[PDB]
Nucleic acid binder design. Sequence first.
DNA 1: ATCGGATGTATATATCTGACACGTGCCTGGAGACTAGGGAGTAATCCCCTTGGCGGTTAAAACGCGGGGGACAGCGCGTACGTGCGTTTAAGCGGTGCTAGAGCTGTCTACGACCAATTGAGCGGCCTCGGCACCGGGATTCTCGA
DNA 2: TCGAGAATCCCGGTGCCGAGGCCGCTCAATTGGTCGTAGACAGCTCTAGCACCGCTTAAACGCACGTACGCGCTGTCCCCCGCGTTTTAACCGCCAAGGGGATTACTCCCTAGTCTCCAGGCACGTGTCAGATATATACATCCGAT
Lengths: 313, 97, 95, 106, 105, 79, 82, 303, 75, 96, 95
Amino acid sequence: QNYPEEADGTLDCISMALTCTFNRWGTLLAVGCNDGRIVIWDFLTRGIAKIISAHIHPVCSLCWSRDGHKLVSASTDNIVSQWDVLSGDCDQRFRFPSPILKVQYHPRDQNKVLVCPMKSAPVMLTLSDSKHVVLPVDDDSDLNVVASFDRRGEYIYTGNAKGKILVLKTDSQDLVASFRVTTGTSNTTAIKSIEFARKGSCFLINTADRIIRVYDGREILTCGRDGEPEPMQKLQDLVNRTPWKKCCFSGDGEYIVAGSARQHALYIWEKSIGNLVKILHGTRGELLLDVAWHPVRPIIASISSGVVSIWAQ
Amino acid sequence: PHRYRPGTVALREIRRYQKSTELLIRKLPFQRLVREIAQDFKTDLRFQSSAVLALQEASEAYLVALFEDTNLCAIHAKRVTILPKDIQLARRIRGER
Amino acid sequence: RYRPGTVALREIRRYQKSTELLIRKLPFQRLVREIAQDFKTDLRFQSSAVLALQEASEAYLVALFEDTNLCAIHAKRVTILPKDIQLARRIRGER
Amino acid sequence: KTRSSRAGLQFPVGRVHRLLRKGNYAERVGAGAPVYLAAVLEYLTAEILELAGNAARDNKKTRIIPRHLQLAVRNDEELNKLLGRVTIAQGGVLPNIQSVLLPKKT
Amino acid sequence: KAKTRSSRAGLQFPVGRVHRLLRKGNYAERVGAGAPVYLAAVLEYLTAEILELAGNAARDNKKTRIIPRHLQLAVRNDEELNKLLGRVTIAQGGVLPNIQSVLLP
Amino acid sequence: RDNIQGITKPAIRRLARRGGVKRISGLIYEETRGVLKVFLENVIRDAVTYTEHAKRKTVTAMDVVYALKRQGRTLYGFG
Amino acid sequence: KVLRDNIQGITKPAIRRLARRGGVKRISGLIYEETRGVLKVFLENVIRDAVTYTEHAKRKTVTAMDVVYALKRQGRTLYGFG
Amino acid sequence: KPNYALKFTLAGHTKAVSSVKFSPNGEWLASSSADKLIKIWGAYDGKFEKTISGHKLGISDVAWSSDSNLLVSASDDKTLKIWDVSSGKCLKTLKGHSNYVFCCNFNPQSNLIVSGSFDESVRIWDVKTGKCLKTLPAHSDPVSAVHFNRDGSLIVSSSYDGLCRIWDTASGQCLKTLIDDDNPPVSFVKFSPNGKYILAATLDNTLKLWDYSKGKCLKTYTGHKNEKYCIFANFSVTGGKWIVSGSEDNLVYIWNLQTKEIVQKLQGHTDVVISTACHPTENIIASAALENDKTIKLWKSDC
Amino acid sequence: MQIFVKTLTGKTITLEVEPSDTIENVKAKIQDKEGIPPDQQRLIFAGKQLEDGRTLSDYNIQKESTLHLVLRLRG
Amino acid sequence: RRKTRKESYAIYVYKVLKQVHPDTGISSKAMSIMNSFVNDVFERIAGEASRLAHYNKRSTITSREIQTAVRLLLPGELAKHAVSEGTKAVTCYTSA
Amino acid sequence: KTRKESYAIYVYKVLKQVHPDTGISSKAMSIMNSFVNDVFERIAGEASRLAHYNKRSTITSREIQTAVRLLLPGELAKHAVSEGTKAVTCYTSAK
DNA sequence: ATCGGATGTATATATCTGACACGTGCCTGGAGACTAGGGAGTAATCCCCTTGGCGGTTAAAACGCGGGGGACAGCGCGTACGTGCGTTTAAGCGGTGCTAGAGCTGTCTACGACCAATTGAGCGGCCTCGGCACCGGGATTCTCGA
DNA sequence: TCGAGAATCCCGGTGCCGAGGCCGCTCAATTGGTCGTAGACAGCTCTAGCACCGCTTAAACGCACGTACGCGCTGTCCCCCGCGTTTTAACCGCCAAGGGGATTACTCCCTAGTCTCCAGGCACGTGTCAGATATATACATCCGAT
């Protein structure tokens, strides 16, 4: 139904907690502790699943496979291991030249994992033969490009650190779609991150000019090689000018969230009508790390500084 | 010395403190008190060594005044002591219920 | 009729319901002009100001009485005496 | 062109902007201060009128007499803390009788 | 260029300074050459009075150094200053001695 | 001039009933009238000076509200 | 961290001496706790206003002028600190 | 069509396997019998975990929490105990009942417990210690079933009397008392996911479910036998839209929510099916019967 | 003749535009048809700027094409 | 003599009352009391904002200063509701 | 290092004018700086509001005189207004 | 009531050492000089009600008598506070390094004042109609002395 | 435990002056450039509130006991409330005027704003001394002796 109106306590099965993500409809919670361990908590039941001793240097990003049989994590020590969900051991091990930002799995192709290396083109690794393919990019090859799938993962969208966004094929690698962002009035601006959804091919773009924007995953190919940018909603805050670090999308395909870092001003809007609807009264003092709704039921659960603040119904 | 009758040295103590000028509350306990009580409003605040002093000064002054008012109420009840009801009465009549 | 204490509560409840002013205007105005004459006389006033004054004063008085009542209850009695008014005005901070 | 309908308020925004400009509160006023202040005034006045109308409903009077305003303000606690050193003309007092001073018999 | 305005009337405390501090005070639109001057006048007058009573209590107590206690006692004991400074506090001062009659044995 | 006693005794009886008290000593009326004198004088001083600085020898009606507001009170319902 | 301690830091002789300067001889033994309470509730408002003033000014330190500003806003002024 | 085919036939107890419940987390099966034994069996492989013991006589009802950590068993030795699923040792005591314990369940919030005996009341205990907290009068007859709602705010009380009752957890007083003129005895109730419908397993060959929104009699679920024994019921929304229940004709049956159609008749049990359980994350059904079966059937399916 | 308008959620709507019909008439027809305010919508053709105060005859968009109806905020 | 014009918050609070309760009226003395209430609150908040701007060495009245004023002035949850309404109004106004 | 505003010498001079024997510590000129700056803020705000009250474009002497008559009680008002009129005459005579 | 002894109060003596005042460099506001332009006030005027005064009269108070409930003085009792002291326990210096923190300035890009002129929301004068003021009478609830 | 009398609330019954509407006539609220600027981002520069522990001791804890006083009870007596009455100025109804409250014209003059050299005041050293520290003594007071 509508936006959450009740608030609940904290879910700390273990003291340390960095990252959080739901699988498909909020089954299990994957937490990457800052000690080299990966913990699996049970959501909607208030329990735990398994604790995995990955390595010494801790992890900072985590995700699950398409079939749910693998636990991949963007390690800080460049340990690209496919930890088994069942046994908790290491199935396949490989080392990458650069650290990763976001790890994802194609919901139709588990073999090709998603990697976002630093200062290099995105790498797509086949787990059938441990073969890495460099995604073809444009302009500079040393920009912090972030790659992400579409709704179904059939296309891969990559964002450079200058203002160029490319769209290419998840398996064919036929670069045909490119885009140049608007340069405002006088100065160009880099783009921080892009976050996708599950219905409607919507995607939010967090940029460096302190304004969030929203677009659709069907405009880059239709315009041709390159066209004119056309934001749908230029959402921002004008009372504090809050910088944006993390931001997710809704589970029903109609709402949109923008998060704070230290001011605990969680803003929410809806795509149809771009007005403010609710603001979260969060206790100041912590830096927000991850936010994710149930892909079915409207909820917010922000993990930060080892604790989690949950607002639901 | 010996067990002496009450009320003789209380008057001298009143005379001593009512004339003197110093700070009746120890410094460091007030330091820790303000540090603890500023936790709720924002975490990891750092104080000026001259600010807190000011603060504590004002506080004690207020407290002293309250007691005087309380004393008056006690004299109105035809007794000498100070019972917790007098402070509540003084607070209510004062305007800060 | 008889039995003081019951008709007292009767009128107390009537008056806690009622909303009427109860003070006169001409001694009010002669005091006004004389206490101006203490400073400056023959000042050209208005006509609806008087009412205003009265309103405030009445509120003042009734509020004051409340505090005095408490003081009486503090001395384990019911009757209010000139002593309680002075106590209430002194501890209030208006001496 | 209208400016209060831009934000959905009902108190005027040009009037508040003019009144804030000519009152010499500062040398150079902003552009979001009038709308912010108009919204705050909206919320406060609607908050008062809600209980004012409810108390009028107690008396069934279509018009809301001042005693309803007095009852609404004094019965609540936050509005008590706000309008504490304040008197309301013609509004009367809120009923109260001391607990000890309750004459009773068999 | 000489002869600062504070000495234009035989006065001591700064008047160019107070003139400036009403200039940039953003209090009004035109700042005159007389109003902060009279502010400096009451400055000299009341400061002389107030350190006067300070030194008066000092010579009543034969201290070679003045503490704010003398000032607090002078303000507290007087009547019109007590009425004007009804809600006020003085740093590192105290209370004038007073004992209730009933309390005395 | 002498007109102080006009405020009658049952009037302050009614005000005491308003306040919430039932038993009143018979020697309470004099100091209530004294309090009324003090309050009235303080209010009317400020009222009259507020009118005097109009550069007009006259008096207005908002000046009572001005005096009440500056004294510490404040009145709603008159301009 | 929030712990029940450190409320009791201002000892009983301190309240004794403040009462003595207030001018009292006899004080019952159960006034200390509510004195703790009234001191705490007085401190809360002033510190809240001070931290608001320091938060609007974009620093995380309160000066000796924010405290006096807050006190003057409350109704009690300070002389001696700026 | 729900093609639930038997894959594992489990029979490890001695007296009668009359209580098997699939926990909402769907990890293990805590089979119970009237021989003071609690045997933990597997779910997708039927692996033998252990046999927790420690009571004195048989158990009437067994339940796991949402996280399947706490374990309540209706042992009739005037005591109830919680057994750790990891080890199988006594955690805390539930003293306070005066007679045989007939019913007991858990709270999805994992913070409250309800137990019932022949003292015409239902009691709750602190989960940390296990002391006496409240004794709410449920009915004038022994309570056959009691369970919390998914929202953790309401309780449904069913007994052999017939008038269903919904009790507030926040105050201990009943909200709605649905009264039936014929007053047919009830055996089991279960809360709906939205907490609006209840399924009163009535002892009149009819699973008369009730709506406490307005208090109106609804359609009649027939095609089975329910007259004497405490027959339970459960939901199934994984493969389709179905409700599973036992019957006194010695078979398990399944129906629809509001269509009144028989779609599957699980056979194999030789005696009256006293309890039914449906796996939460899989189309697996386990049904427990009376003394003449002593067997557990894992009916697995994919749609 | 008939063309398509695409919303953000992904649904496409087949609509009729006369060759001698201005854009404002089409916007009014859409507003009366589905209720979406014209101030919450605009015309975009292959990432190129289009306004409301013109005609499709001047722009000359080819047949059987789609127009990306970019959502706006009311007003 | 030569006529003058005066502004009061009459029609606006009438609209607010009609929107909240479309069955009740108002009196002239209630009208005056509501007008005086609005003027009092306006003066209080504007004065606090001006003094805050002067104290922080700023010459401009931004919208942050007014929100700090209503945080310092309004008590409890009333401040939260007021700041939420103000932020909603300014966010709705800016993008139009 | 940088420049800041404070009265240090003038207070010592005005202490020396009548009482040329006694010195003071930091707290003393602190409290007099506090008094001067706080009466400064209070007094300029009072003057400016009393100004905007009556629709003008400066700060004058007469508004200050009426405000002095409206805040201060009798004898302090007399002394202050007397010294102020002496200051006005002595400044206007020689500019 | 009267007198003596232990005990805390109040004052003079070496001295010293950290804090007060005196001396100094030279850099950023302030008054010396000067204009024009915009507020204001000062002489004049005209109409509204306050300023000032009179005929009716009345419900409310000024002034005198009746009586019982509460205020006020005294007396006993046992209880909690004051005065003392032995001792543990955490304040008071004191000293030390410093990392993570607060704070002064070059600058250029985004934001508000101003103005020309437009022109509809809003205020003021005139109906206007009923919500509500005023009034008559019967139904309804309460209290204490038999 | 029970009625006479006394208070209170409501149902019409009727008329009336205030809140609302409407027409008409403004006046200030925009729109768009224009322009000037101040306040925001990065840089380096200072540094101190704080972790860290060491040695010392005022003083807060805790126990002992002795007793002044808070509290409860009794009794006496006096004065506050209520009842009634006769008398009464404070408020109803009106009228007039005058003068000044509000409004206009206008000319004059006060200072915002600009250029400016100096001067005089704030940061940095360096000499000096007034009350703290501990000691020794005369004296006033609670408390106990008669």
